[PDB]
Each structure stands twice: as structure tokens, then as C-alpha cells.
Write a protein that binds this DNA or RNA. Structure first.
Length: 50
DNA sequence: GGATGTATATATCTGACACGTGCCTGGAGACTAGGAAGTAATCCCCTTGGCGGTTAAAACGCGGGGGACAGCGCGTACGTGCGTTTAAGCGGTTGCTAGAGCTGTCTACGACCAATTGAGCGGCCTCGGCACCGGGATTCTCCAGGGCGGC
């Protein structure tokens, strides 16, 4: 899921437009450079709560 | 008796219309100065229709041969197709820097104006050089005297 660490990358808008009820991310490094990567991951998971 | 083709209805996507707002740039109104329109005078170039004379260019004719074009052969180099490689295209990382945009301050540099004067334009006088006329030095053609031959 670290490949999904960028919100502006085309994979993010490709996977965020999918009509899926439940999502899950498997990764080894959740944070790599800053808090914004984790913010993008939790926005992909829960869009609005965090 | 079961499932398939087709018609009408409903929810969703998407381009377009109108509403709202800023802002800044164009428009309205007034004033002024100078750019350009108009006028008169002077002088030189251009127009149209002629004439005269020179002469070199243009036109015409003719012969001939050089060159353009057509045909043929040939061989090579480029097109075509297929299998393999490779690198373009896309998506992505990661930081730093260049640059556009905006705001702000200030200072040196260029516009502007008045007085001045010295470099540019025209004519006049003089010199350098080329040319016209007079005088001296040098060389070429010619007329006459002396000697020899013939009746």
C-alpha cells in the first residue's frame, strides 16, 4: 500500500472511484516520509472521518 | 408450459444557462495645445505631340550540327515482409531550485526646458597638376663646282 501513499497519483483516483463497500491495505511500511502519506491512506480507507 | 425479443418508465450523467462578485479597464465629461488643413509664392520636373540625324540594335533568313528525347539493356539498390530486440511511453520517487506572480521601497536615470555654441552646409580663394605657347639645341635633304669622256 505504500505505492498508494500519494493522493495525486493516478492509482489513487483509479482505486478511489471503485464502488467497493470494504477496503483493506496490506503494507510493511505505513509511514515513509511524512504524516501526509498516512493521511492519504486513511482518506482512502475512511474518506472524511480522519 | 418455459424463456426470449421488445416497449415504456425511472434514476443518473453531463453540457449549458443564469446568478453572484470583484476589479479594473473602458467610457463620459471638461480643458488645452499643437498637428494638420488651408493659402500664397517660387521654381523645377513631367506630359503630349511633334521634328531631325546617327547608328547600333533588332529582325529575318538559312545552313548545319549539337543536344534533347526516346528506346533498350542491366544490375543494383531499395521496397517488402517477417522475427527479434529495444527503447519509447506511462506512471512514480525525492528533494532542490528557477521562475511567475504579488507587494513594497527607493534611487539613479532619463524626460524636459532654457541658454549657448560649435559642428554641418554652402560659396570663395588658393594650390597641385595638366596643358598651351615661345625659345634654344640637334639632325636631314639639297644645289652647285670640279673632273672625265665623246665627236
Amino acid at each position: 500500500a505504500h505505492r498508494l501513499k500519494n493522493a495525486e497519483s493516478s492509482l489513487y483516483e483509479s482505486l478511489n472511484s471503485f464502488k467497493v463497500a470494504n477496503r483493506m491495505l496490506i503494507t510493511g511500511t505505513p509511514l515513509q516520509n511524512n504524516i501526509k502519506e498516512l493521511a492519504a491512506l486513511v482518506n482512502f480507507l475512511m474518506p472524511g472521518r480522519f
